[model samples]
Target: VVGGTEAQRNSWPSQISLQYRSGSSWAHTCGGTLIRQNWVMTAAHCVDRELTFRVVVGEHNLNQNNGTEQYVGVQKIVVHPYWNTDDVAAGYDIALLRLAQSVTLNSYVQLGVLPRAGTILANNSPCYITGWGLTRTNGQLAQTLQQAYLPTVDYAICSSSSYWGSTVKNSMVCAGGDGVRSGCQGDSGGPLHCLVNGQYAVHGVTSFVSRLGCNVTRKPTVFTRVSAYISWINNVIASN
Candidate 1:
């Protein structure tokens, strides 16, 4: 994230690292939320490459042993049927990955709390974007996890001509167009944890940012609104 700081180890327990095997090692390609014992929520584009992927929960550092990490192989992937790689602006960028085995829950690893179906936060609602993404545009990934306060920008304002225009949709959530703090490369598919009703919930799946730059004015980070797909998620879990 641009203009972010190192995140506390237990601040976002559901946050996970989605990795791809590279030779003898694995590389962190995206972030995900552990929504169930064996299911992870991420962006469809993260798995578009068809690489062998794994999910690491309780991971705070990408290159070192944190002693709280649990690595597991992905058993199946379910991308939103309507997702179009070339049409991210049209929405439907979410995906779910089933793990080969169910992971145990603990303080360091737990299921992400999801918002109710069709729930929408008010304008400028409190939220944070966390990931190991770049610290700046075109910069390298951070050695540790980072987080930034990214207030929600309601759809009406986000879809305005001066903002993202037609690219922003109701199925998406926009946050942090302040050009100071925002999600960047490698942060895709991460959770946008929003505080509502005195509790926090996974309300978004980080999808995209302005192509001009990671932190651009009037181009808040866009996410796949998780609440919009609650029914779809339940159906997938039940059928799988």
Candidate 2:
């Protein structure tokens, strides 16, 4: 996040670090939300490369051992079948990771509450984007997780020519295009938590930002709308 603050320890327990073995070390490549004890929600693009992947729950610091972390190997991965790697603008960027073992629920680890099916937020709805992504467009990865307030931008406005235009679809959510507070590289596959009816739900799976820059004006971070894929998620979970 370009304009974010360090997330308080364990503030978002469902937040996870999606990593891949890079040579001798595991590198945090993206953020994900623990949807179930054994299921993690991330972006399809995050795992597009052929590499060994693992997920770390209860992770707060990417470079430090917080003692609250649980490392688990990914037994399987299910990227949205319709997802097209060459066309992120067309949307279906979600993916689910099935863990080899389920982690126990604790104060530091929990399942992210997903929004009700078909739920859509109104413009300017209260929300925040959380991740250990980047603090700037050209900066190093954040050692600690960070969060920035990114209010929702309704589809109509977000689809305006001056905004994201035709690329912003109803199947996606747009937030924070102010060129200040926004998601940066490595923030992909993270959660866009929106407050609805006094509770926060995972309404988005961080998908993409502007190619011009991470925090470019009129180009808010886009996400795979979680509500739009509830059926697909359920079927994948049941069949896998």
Candidate 3:
């Protein structure tokens, strides 16, 4: 999990999961979100690989604990028609997952708000992230939800390094410390959340991490600024 704390676990939504199975397994597989009763959002890349998977929702514990885990078939996988992962401008990272059955609404899990475009996230802003990712690279992914608070870094600061120039595109935002609280491996497609109006908003998505390490000075965790692609996201949701 990206943001792992007792407080974060209790406050942030715990309905998202990363689904996968080993070779020859009788399973549809992919990573997705439990956005609405019947709708989910995920990265287009996951669909390019795994086609069948489950929507494990409302579990604070990612592994062995009791939670409302839904094993619904994927009704439809809708990627932004124009998305092209090969090109930076194509913005092919976003996707939608419609479930075979509509899930019941409850306080345990709910849809999150997307931030407004052009909204600036300042440094030290109290933001949280949750995931089933590894605590450190090369480690097994955690079976429990984890979270961490991140601070926003200025574009100039992020752009200062040559290593980040190619991957940290204009469509992204940077968080975490040089060598502190970071979105290491296994955290892709997770939410980068910030509190707004007494609620947490999905402002960014854990996109890429520097292969170098989690906590490298001048190298913060980079995420997709979801607010920048509201039209694409809304249109995808509306399509279903």
Best by lDDT: 1
The Cα RMSD in angstroms, rounded to one decimal, for candidate 3 relative to the true structure is 3.0
TM-score of 2: 0.99
TM-score of candidate 1 relative to the true fold? 0.99
For residues 1-240, write the lDDT of model 1, one tens digit per residue: 999989999999999999999999899999999999999999999999979999999999888899999999999999999999999999999999999999999988989999999999899999999999999999999889999999999989999999999998899999999989999999999999999989999999999998899999999999999999999999999999
Overlapping backbone residue pairs in candidate 3 total: 15
Model 3 scores a TM of: 0.84
- The residue pairs in collision within model 2 are none
Tell me which of candidates 2 and 3 scores higher on TM-score. 2
lDDT of 1 at 145: 96
Taken over the whole model, the C-alpha lDDT of each candidate is 0.95, 0.93, 0.65
Which ranges in model 1 have alpha carbons more than 4 Å from their true place? none
lDDT of 2 by residue, 161-213 (tens): 99988998899999999889999989999999988888889999999998788
For each candidate in turn, give its C-alpha RMSD to the true structure in angstroms.
0.6, 0.7, 3.0
